[PDB]
A = this chain, B = another copy of it.
């Protein structure tokens, strides 16, 4: 086509979605991780994660207001990944890299899994 494009549009949209999350506006699901609860928007979770995409396209699960993750999932790893989903920023540290990578593999967040693999390989 002959469209023009606003370079900062996608980033501004994600920034606003994160502001709605902060203020708990229009959040439609609670993710339960080892009795730690995280409120989010189903569409943002689907847009970032192969696991949430599969969950919320399921005819029965699409209607659930609570999703319980596997008990092996670490709440801090989930929190770091939820923050990444809404900001593009990943708080990756020596002390959390194993939990973050395991959570990203479970959530099916391939780009996060890739950078964790590379950061681990650099330290060996």
Residues on A lying within 8 angstroms of B by beta carbon are 1-7, 9-14, 16-17, 20, 25-26, 41-44, 46-48, 56-57, 62, 84-85, 88-93, 111-112, 115
Contact = CB atoms under 8 A, between A and B. Distances in A.
A12 B17 CA distance: 14
B17 A91 contact: no
Given A10-B14, A13-B14, A5 B57 contact: no
A67 to B, nearest CB: 14
Contacts of A44: 13, 43
A25 B91 contact: no
A2 B93 contact: yes
A96 B112 CA distance: 42
